[model samples]
Target: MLDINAFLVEKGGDPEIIKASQKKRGDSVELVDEIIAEYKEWVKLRFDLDEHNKKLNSVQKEIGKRFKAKEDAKDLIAEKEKLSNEKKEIIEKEAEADKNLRSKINQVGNIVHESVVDSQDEENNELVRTWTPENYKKPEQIAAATGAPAKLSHHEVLLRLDGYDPERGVRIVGHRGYFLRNYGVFLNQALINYGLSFLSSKGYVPLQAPVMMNKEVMAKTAQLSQFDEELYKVIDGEDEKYLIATSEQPISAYHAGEWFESPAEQLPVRYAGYSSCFRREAGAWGIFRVHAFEKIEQFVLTEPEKSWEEFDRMIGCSEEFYQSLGLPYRVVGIVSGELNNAAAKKYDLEAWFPFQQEYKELVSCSNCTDYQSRNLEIRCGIEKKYVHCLNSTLSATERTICCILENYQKEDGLVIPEVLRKYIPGEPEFIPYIKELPKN
Candidate 1:
């Protein structure tokens, strides 16, 4: 959730933000309006309750003294009981106010930022920038689709040559689930290892976190409203357990309830996290949206003043990673409607996929500021100041492998990247380590 007070004051209660927030929670905007009104009323009632309790306490104390002073003061017992009953009634009203507001507040998702363009679909999105051999007059003019396994997909060359098992993968993991059986396994491992190494060189503390987590923690660091429906939960116990959607959850939870250093220079603490994320994409479409995936999620803890700089730094890292693979990619500024709960400003890396002739989202880096840190109570400074949290996808292993397989494939049907072959066993530095060769 963002600073709604600033949003309200800046846009005079932005209707789009409010409407988006309402829709996300399956709530009616009209109902939200009513909720706000009720909340304000409750605020007043709380004050009244506090005053009533204080007055009742004062009266009781005075009566006790009077009772000790004279026997007639015993008559004040009835008056004290009457005040006590009044206090009880006030307490009930206060409780109801809290109940009503909380019931509504919990359902309200964060507001859509004002920066999002007004459009119904991805087409209407503002093309902040693009990278292609030849620019298409319109995105529709470009021919590309993102779904199906790599072998069945347009990147037939890479899928056939590299180790891939669409059949067994689907049987075991369902559709979009396939094993990069042989050569493909080599490629995926090469990319994952390379990516981790690259990040380590940049001062990021590499972490392999738990894939399963408690839902309460997810609610604090990530967008449970949007992504929860897609999460896999272990419902066999008293407490709910959920597979981690990303390393961000565990990494961010690392600083929960702790304050960072107060000095501006000693503010930001950068952490590099690696996790095998799981998404139960029930209604998913396209090759990009999958049930289980691996990602290098980069996180940072910093003060408010340094957040934007860190945000740009993260974007730089995304661009650099893609460049390392010799893949053409672009940095896109996502609209407010597309921004999730934590991002004040967001950038998505759309890597150019040759077969799709369209760039697919490979990574997302966002500056969440203190929107999340405040919720999780992660703070720094002598005064225990809340810290800004920024998250960026250093790389997604599956999609990056897909990118390399398609873009770096040679006409001989062997897909290879110069940097990868060195690490893969029995693989030539420049040629495919063919599992089987055509009979000459």
Candidate 2:
């Protein structure tokens, strides 16, 4: 969940978020603001209750001394009882305040991005650019190819791949599930290795985190609210957990309540977290969306002040990786509505898919700016202040395979990039998958 304080701030804040939240909650933003004010009051009252309780304890201790008068002891006991009653009242008020506040926040957050010039639907998103590395400058020439259409789609080729058994996947895992066989395995590993190597050189440490989490931690991160519909819940009779949707969730939880060194030196902790992520994906389909996929996720827990710089660095890394793969891509800023619930701002690296002959989003980078960190209570430094968070799609292995098929496919067959031969070993060049397969 986004911080109410930051969301309310005139700087780096959005009035639209409050308006959207109000619409979702079916309440006015003014009422929502009042609820926030009430919440703050409740917190103050709780603090006061604590202070009074401490004073009561001190007075009771003093009354125990023989030097203290009997009347003073009686007065102290009465005062203690009064303080206890006051604490109870504050507790009730605090609970009510919290309940009302949650509803208000939810309601005000429903405003969609005005900049999404493309309607609410993903398919409606306009193709801002499309090109291959060979003719990134002259996209017109690239579009002039013989067999490929002017607008190529990666999902089209992925669906046609021999080993992507949708039916089998459904039998085993239900809807929106599929398997990548044969070279798909090689492609997944190759892409992951390539991404990791590329990210590691840029000062990102490799991190691995648990895929399942307790309900409390998950709820705290606010992913459970909306993602509850898209998350696979685990039920072990009494125990409960949620299958992680991405490395971003797990990696962010890794430092919950932990402190770090000063921001100047150990400030920005960057990780290239590689994980097999699970998502319900629900009705989402086509090339990019899937139930289970391997991803090289870039997660940064950094000082809130320097987060924007780190966000751009992440985008630069994504750009560099695509550039290295000889994939033509473009970067776009996400409008307010399109930004994730936790992201303040976002950018996407959309790659040109040759088969569909169009640009498809391959990577997404976000400057979450303490949204996840605050929910997870993941802090840096001795102060335990909320740290900013940044998550980006380092690269999706399966989706990249789609890009590879479209971009790397030659007139003869799919030609492998020269840079990848070191990892693939055998071929210095591309080979046709059909010819490579033995005649049955």
Candidate 3:
């Protein structure tokens, strides 16, 4: 579905740009040339097949007239049969060549932006900005603001005062499964409603996207191959399916193989989708590293000329949301090697975790350009070009709530943020403990 013609037009067969883009995405440069050559072969074969089909049709008409006249039609019938068989063989060969060409194109990644900083990993990522409370400027300021001893990690606190049952969770559901008891359930739901309303107020169509999708949808979004290790497949279902890793997958592919039908007054079509996401990973065992999580995701489709602006708007909204929660966070430009095949450029918002004494990624935003839409055959505008697709985490329930607990926990209880108070029952700002708390 990728526009091979557009790719050639944009890059103009420049070896340097081609190799550089492939290398940035950690893909093989050799594959690009192979696809180009294969495409040319498909083109030539397609033309030859068309010519042969025309000649074969003419021969069939001549054979029909010879049979009607009752003349010796042996030579004419023989020629017609031979041409028909040759056409069939040529059609089969063309189909195979087209399949191979598409496979090679799918193997290559999206083109990287020229301005992106080329780097190997997250360590080489560039920090763009940092946001914090009014008086607090950096991680060092965290100790004095909360005035709480870093005695218990988030997990320890959750296990003790938060009424989490990880032992029972494992017994019933195996590893990476846990129950949220007491206010934990309320806090989780509160965060979801809060994020949903916030995006809704901003004109993003509120959507509850599907959690399960077919493999074709996954492949179109570039998730099947890129995130094969983390994907969960449904074995017992009537049809083979996959659980979504994020709402972005379904939301971006919502209009797959469909056109906008008409040009819109507004450039970007935006949606805020809510869904329970699942992953099948074996490493990093903790509540923070769980197999199941809920998230409010932002998705958009815009013209290529306006995509960059929409990207910044998405970042601005995320920054505003985090800032309102009074969480200290920094925005980092994700390095090329750390990016997936779907994103032309990406940014991650890592929130400060006082308990862990490090920043952890809580929100991620990406400008996918036409990488996903092209694969899904999603187009827009009167000219019917591929619309740029972008997605960002408006809020994730588990990690975000984890950050709030770690940052707001006091000697007696946890202090809830003011913004989320409306969503919580009774608008209680603090969670009081009735039993002796754990201290490490």
Candidate 4:
């Protein structure tokens, strides 16, 4: 279902550029050469097979002509059967050669972009930009300045306010399960609505995505990256389905085997998909690290030439989103060694959470170029060039809710952002100031 760039392979017999690209990814450079070798073997087999088929068809026609004329056709019949058997043998050989070629091609990744660094380490990530509150101090610094101890964690604070209950949640639905009683429910929905409104205004079509995706699409998507452990498999008798870790999976599958009639039409197709995401996270439990969460995802299909421009525009949208919410964040360019198979370049949006007092990845933006589209056969123009694909985290509601919870916490109450206030109707400006379910 998935395939790499056959265009590059077709043009290069020696595979020098592909080898260098693989080197940047810390992958075996020889694999590129191996793929090229197998490709040639498959091509030679196919050429002979086609020639044999033509010969066999001509022999059959000659035999028929001899029979109609009432001549001895025994010799011609023998020749036709011989040619047919030869063609069958060649077909088997070609099938094996093709399989070998696909195996090697699957092991390699897309060509790495030049801007990326060589290392995979987080220390090598290049800082692009940062935003912080004016004259702002870290939460610990502020607490000391006020002669008070640091505040409780977001979970603790939410628990005290009677907005969340982890104990009961764990008891009922297992760990990482919780109920959002008052402010928690209101704030999560508000963030989703705000994100939808913003992206819709920016011309991204809003969509409610299906959490379940077919195994065929999943395999194709995995060619760009692998997260097998994170996937939850559902067996419906003989059929196997998977719970999607992100809406990008289903959205990608939606356009599978589809293409544009012309390069001029629908060059850029953008979609903002929202859905419940599931991940089997193996770690501590919190709203920030949970098995399931709600997310608004940014997905797009754009022309190859405009891919980098779209990548920048997409990240700019995420940056503006955090800016409007008044959260501290920075964008970092990911190194080549850290890249997924699909992403030529990726930028992660790290937001500062006072709870941890460190920058955490709240969003990610990637330019896959033609890596994914080529695999899915999504093409455009008269020449059928593959389109570029991209995906980014617009808002993972639970994680961002933690950022908002701690950033806006005050002695009076939890101060909801003014932008989100409009979404949470008939509620106090600050949560816990006036409760929906009053104290017992």
Candidate 5:
């Protein structure tokens, strides 16, 4: 939940400002006003409850005096009992009002950034820039480089080489689950290791995040109900724990309900989190969209003023990784309607897939500003003010491996990008998947 007091002040306590802000997210302005009105009423009821308590206290004192005087204090006792019941009713109503107000307030999303253009969907997102390898200037050039007339998709190549098995995977564990065998295992590890190494060299602290979390902590990062289909809840003992959809959730919770005492010099804290992430991914069944996957996530906790700068730097880091691997990619600014509730502004890096013949989103970076910090009670500065949060994908192993196979496949075999060779010892220059197979 957001800090109502702080949010009200941030909006300058004007309903119009609040309404316009909510309207950008397709919210009802009247609903915003309704909640504010109810909250005010709840506040007044608190005061009334306090006053009633004081009067009850005074009545008890008078009753004590009457009992000492040996007079009939029966009526005084009855009046005191009636006052107590009235106080209880007032308390009940106050609690109900507060619950209703908070429920409505949570409906309001984060304020959209001023620069974010108005758009209804991702197709309208603005393209920031694009990068392609030096030799491949055009799509025709990339196709000619392959040197093969018949191109196999990543899944087909992996299946033929025994690198992945979706058939047995679904039979054993249901849909969207697969086994990575042979060279596929090497590719997965190499991607994660490479990503972690890159982030570490950039001064990020590496952390192996936990995959399970209680409901309270998850709620601090996002609205659990909103992610009903996407979240996998664990039924264990009495406590409710959910399988993390991304390392971002656990990394953000690492400092939840805490205050940072660092000086101004060390305002931003960067983390490189490596974890096996799990999601329900209900209704979606593909290697790209799976129930479990490995991810190298980049997270930062920074001063509010510097968050936007840090956001761009994170995007740069992702761009550098994709470019170094010689992957064709593009960057786009996410519009207001597409922005998540936590992010004030966001950008996505989509890499081109040769077989798919289109760009697929590989990484998403966002500057959440103080929206998450306020909810998690993560504070900075000497006065313990809310800090800012930002996160982006360094790499998702399965997806990146898919992109690499599709982009780097050749007539002979699969070529390893020079950057990843160091991690795989004796780094066979090329995958022998197709060559090793018995020829027809």
Candidate 6:
């Protein structure tokens, strides 16, 4: 939630800027007006409460002085009682107004960064750069550039490799559930192993986060109002908890209500959290979108002064990881309307899928600024300011494998990345196509 005091101009905040941000997000601009109105109402009630209490105290003082002088104090005492009742009524109104204003202000999303693209169409997002290992062109790109046989889709190739069971998984767990058999299973584990090793070498603390989160904790970590439908809730004994859509959710709240002194000196706490995440957005397709998936994410908490620099560093980390996998990809700056509610600015690494002839989101790096830290009360610095929180997908094992199957496939076989060879048995550099071939 926004710090309403800092957003209202009367309190030395900027309501016009907030309104502009609201409009950019495609949110109701009138909602910002409503927030200002409620805030002013609360302020007025608080002032009235203070004045009433002051009057009540003066009347009591007058009564006490009259009593000490042995003069008549009955009238003064009655006046004090009347003022006391008025003050009590005003106190209730003040409390109600405060609650109302807080609720209204909570609806405001994070202020959009100026760097974000202004359109709703994600295709219009700013392309930072692209990567393509030498001699490693996507089959679709190659086919389009010079007529040749286009490569099969990851779905078809995985099937031919004797590795994917999409329908059987759907039979047991409904849509979006899938099984990765044979070499696909080993490849999935290798991706996870590579991601961990890559970040461990970067000094990020590795953590295995618990995916189940209390509703209250999740609200602090994310804007649950807009993202409620994406969550999967589970009944645990008598409590209902949300299954996190990313390891970032649980990691954000890991230090809730914590404060660190001198963040300027001891800031930029970096961590890599891995977990099996769950979400409800999976459609009836391949592993592109799934009910459950595995990912190792990068999370950072830093002082406001250094957060943007840290944001660049985090995104760069993900870019380097992708480059090592020898896949074609581009970095995109997300638009305001498409950005997450808690993120001020975000960058998504979209990998080229040859079969689809389009880019698919493989990683999202967001600088949430102080939005999450404030909500969770994770403060730092001598001034007790909220630290900026940033999270990025270092690797989503499932989707990465999908891209790997596309980029590394030769005919119907898969050539595993050299980095992951040590993690698999026999260190097999290649998965040869063993499916029944056409009789020649």
Candidate closest to the true structure, highest lDDT: 6
- lDDT of all the models against the reference? 0.68, 0.67, 0.80, 0.79, 0.80, 0.82
Candidate 2 residues 128-170, lDDT tens each?
4333455455433142223334333344333434425566777
Score every model by TM-score. 0.82, 0.77, 0.93, 0.90, 0.91, 0.91
Model 4, position 344, has a per-residue lDDT of 83
Candidate 4 global Cα RMSD: 3.7
TM-score-superior candidate, 1 or 3:
3
Give one digit per residue, the lDDT tens place, for model 5 in 1-440: 34575335444555555566666666566876677678779979999899989989999999999989988888889999998998999999999998888778777777778777677677888899988887775543243235343276677666656788787899999877699987888888999999989999999999999988888778878764545877888888887898888999999989888787673676688999999988775453236778799999999989888888899899999999998888888999887777777777889999887777778899999988887888788888772478899999999989888778777777666778779888786787677664343334
Ranking by TM-score: 3, 6, 5, 4, 1, 2
lDDT of 1 by residue, 160-247 (tens): 5656666667789787776666666776778778778888899888888898777788777666474547678887568787888888
lDDT of 3 by residue, 1-440 (tens): 34666446344545456567889878798887787778778888889889888888898888888878987888877887888788898889999998888777776667787657798877888899988787665685243236576455677656556557677888999987889887788888998999989998999999998898888778778554645688888875577888989999888888889776453675578898999999897464347889898999999988888888899999999999988888889999988877787778899999888878888999999999988888788877662477899999998888888888777777777777889899988999887754464442
Off by over 4 Å in 6: 61-80, 137-150, 434-440
| Global local distance difference test of model 1 | 0.68
Residue 140 miss distance in model 2 (angstroms): 6.4
List, residue by residue over 1-99, the lDDT tens digit for candidate 6.
Answer: 778776677677888888889888988788888887877787788888888878887887888888899999878878887888888888888898888
lDDT of 4 by residue, 250-343 (tens): 8876687888756567768889999999887637545888878899999998888888999999999999999898788889998888887777
> How would you order the candidates by lDDT, starting with the best?
6, 5, 3, 4, 1, 2
TM-score leader: 3
Q: For candidate 4, list the clashing residue pairs, or say none.
A: none
Give the range where candidate 3 is weakest over 10 consecutive residues by summed lDDT: 141-150
Instruction: Judging by lDDT, tell me the better candidate of 2 and 4.
Output: 4
Backbone clash count, each prediction separately:
9, 24, 0, 0, 0, 0
